Design a protein around this ligand. Sequence first.
Ligand SMILES: Nc1nc2c(ncn2[C@@H]2O[C@H](COP(=O)(O)OP(=O)(O)OP(=O)(O)O)[C@@H](O)[C@H]2O)c(=O)[nH]1
Ligand SMILES: [Mg+2]
Lengths: 79, 177, 140, 103
Amino acid sequence: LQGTILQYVKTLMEVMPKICRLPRHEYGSPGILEFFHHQLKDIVEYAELKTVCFQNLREVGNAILFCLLIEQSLSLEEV
Amino acid sequence: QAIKCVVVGDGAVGKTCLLISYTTNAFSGEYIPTVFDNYSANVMVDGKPVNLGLWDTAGLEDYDRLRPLSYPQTDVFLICFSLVSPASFENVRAKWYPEVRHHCPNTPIILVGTKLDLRDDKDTIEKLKEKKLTPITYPQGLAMAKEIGAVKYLECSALTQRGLKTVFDEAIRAVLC
Amino acid sequence: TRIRSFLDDPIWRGPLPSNGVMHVDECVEFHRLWSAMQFVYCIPVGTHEFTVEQCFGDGLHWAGCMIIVLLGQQRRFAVLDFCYHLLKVQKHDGKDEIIKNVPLKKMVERIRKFQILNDEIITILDKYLKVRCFQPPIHQ
Amino acid sequence: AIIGLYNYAHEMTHGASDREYPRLGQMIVDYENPLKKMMEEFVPHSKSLSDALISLQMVYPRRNLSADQWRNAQLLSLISAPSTMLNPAQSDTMPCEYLSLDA
Ligand SMILES: Nc1nc2c(ncn2[C@@H]2O[C@H](COP(=O)(O)OP(=O)(O)OP(=O)(O)O)[C@@H](O)[C@H]2O)c(=O)[nH]1
Ligand SMILES: [Mg+2]
């Protein structure tokens, strides 16, 4: 969390739009989707998001899931 | 009490910066193309409360199909052209007025002029002379406004805020009257 | 609690809101970044490439939801989210177009599934873990 | 039937009808179409009734707007204007804002 993930989050924050407000319903779903894609276009082209950050996130989620599952098993054994 | 004001014009003219400066008295230098932006402002006109619905529109050519989404049920149009770019001066009559008429034939138009502070600045004037172009003058603005039918043509600068409130003060009056 | 304590960098929460209540427009909070991640990996990928679930499954979503919950932004994330707003608008209007090689109906269905997963994860996290007064206006 | 049975029993037990029976019977036999009779009984009160009713022209029509108007006006949304989140919502007629529509 304090290492690779922190650096990647810091790097991604800079490229994020300075201000982004949800568009009104009058524009419609297609225009809203186009606006969101244009605003977040730079994030989409980024390649390391799906190979390192995602991987790191998967590593932190599996660890917590293993912690939760181990506890339940322990409880069952104790019962 | 509700007013739907839509602001249109060529790209890189100051529409978004104009709206931001008017609404929050803040100015920025960076240029960022916009697709949809909505700003709400409450003003006292003739002692009558009014809610201003400001709708920014993209000036880039790659959003013509996506522009008319904000046109319906609009009260007043605001066409803005840079004072240090004759390109926008021509593009106004070229596209903006006919498009507004096609999509809105009975709506008032308030012609506006941006970059007033740069009208007399040196570096910009010699840079424009390099291309054999000159800043737009008051008589030309009035001539174009009366040619297209705009009921009022004004000046404003998003930096010095000179003539900033009047722009919107006349538009509310245009619909109220 | 230990994982929450590990989060000490100011980047996670950002500066104080200008309006003095909460961030709405500015994207200085991690929840907006997570929403952007959801938007990018919710796009239906081609047939010759793997999806997020195939490679990462639910670990990525669990980690993101845990981070959001520990940062106390689950309500803000639910209220402020690009995918959720897009799905709501699509449901309200009901339109389907190929906007930039991206089907709309499939994308909104994927968003529906992902928010269903996220809601359950956030509810579970909240179930395991479990003011500011403003002044009125003064006459001038 | 109930009124008549009670009156008859009272007369039989005491020899005289109930003191308030005649007025109740007159009211009952007069009110078979209550609206039709009130349209004539309310003539003296018509001026006051119309004066009271006309005052709702500034509240009711604006409170019966369709969902499209509410969506346009972004009714009941805190996040529509974040710079004014601390401003206390208020109006010149506070009670009329939440007054029952069916009423
Ligand atoms: N010095 C100076 N710069 C200005 C003034 N008005 C606008 N600008 C700058 O001109 C540039 C273009 O203005 P913007 O309003 O951002 O462009 P826009 O109207 O949003 O254009 P589109 O997004 O393409 O629709 C920006 O860098 C502004 O800061 C002004 O009065 N003085
Ligand atoms: Mg713009």
